[PDB]
Write a structure and sequence with these properties.
This is part of a larger assembly, with four copies of chain A.
Chain A: E1 16-21, H1 29-34, E2 39-46
PDB class: toxin
Keywords: TcA, Insecticide, Translocase, toxin
Entry title: XptA2 wild type
Chain lengths: 47, 147, 145, 49
Amino acid sequence: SRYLPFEGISVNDSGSLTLSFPDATDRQKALLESLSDIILHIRYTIR
Amino acid sequence: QFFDLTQSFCLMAQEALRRELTDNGVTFIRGGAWNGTTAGLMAGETLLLNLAEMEKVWLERDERALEVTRTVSLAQFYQALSSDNFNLTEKLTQFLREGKGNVGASGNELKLSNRQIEASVRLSDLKIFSDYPESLGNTRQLKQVSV
Amino acid sequence: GKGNVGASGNELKLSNRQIEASVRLSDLKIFSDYPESLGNTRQLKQVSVTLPALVGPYEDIRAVLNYGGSIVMPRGCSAIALSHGVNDSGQFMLDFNDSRYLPFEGISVNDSGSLTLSFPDATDRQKALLESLSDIILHIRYTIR
Amino acid sequence: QFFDLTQSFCLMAQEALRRELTDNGVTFIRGGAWNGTTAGLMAGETLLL
């Protein structure tokens, strides 16, 4: 019934999607070293 | 008091309709519902007519949109950048082994600000418009994002 | 990078940089699958596409299935976009009890129009995927009344 | 204004029914709901019928 996050953003927007990992020095250091890459599954609609 | 609340609801519903149709120019709550000639009466009937007009335009311009999925791998996207590119995994390992780092252009960037790592991807640099022909629709908007 | 084979309606062509495979709906002879009794009104309900290709991970098939007939159809219900090709229904979540019409619903199963599957940028970005493609499968769910 | 909107809704519902039954010949909104003899009244009752 309510909007999903990021819904309605034009796919041609000049804005940026930012992925932030806090405590990346620090508590998430091992996880980020073990990280391979980042994948975004973006579902959008055409009208 | 109730007319004020009701007109607030009508205006926010009109904003919802504008967002749904992606057409900010449509106006249905045209004001003057509370008129001095009738001591405030018929505001309800005026607002009912406006809501009916909104529903009619919504039903007449409703469309079933094409639902597309795009998978964007950040490492490939950063490597394929034309001007300012870098390698995601090696830059991440370097920025972790030494607690500083900043690479890329404004919008397409990998940085280590404070103790928090930030990877920014510009939405237009994904060229999601070119994935499908210029026909089939001009309004292409996100619906959901997963990581 | 040129090609045109088959008859108008039952065709495989490479127009511009986009491949198109058109199949006439009446040439499937779906009316003969069941006896002339059991109902005279046999209409489509839902069309899905399976593309058994060897697509790499993080790569999406980009196909468009369109209907080219003269039947009046609701807005946005004559075309679907295919992005994974494994029983792809073109919708985020398929619901046969939906309040709105599904794409290709209500088209007479003996229509003279054609379903066209178009692969854009097949010269181009989808070349390897289309060579790795084996064939194309249509799952046509229809109703008899 | 409301009678115009309501009759438009009635016509599109009738088109939905025609699509559902695959019978374009059925007609239910036959016109004359807004009659001059009654100054537009009873139009709602006609449309309800």
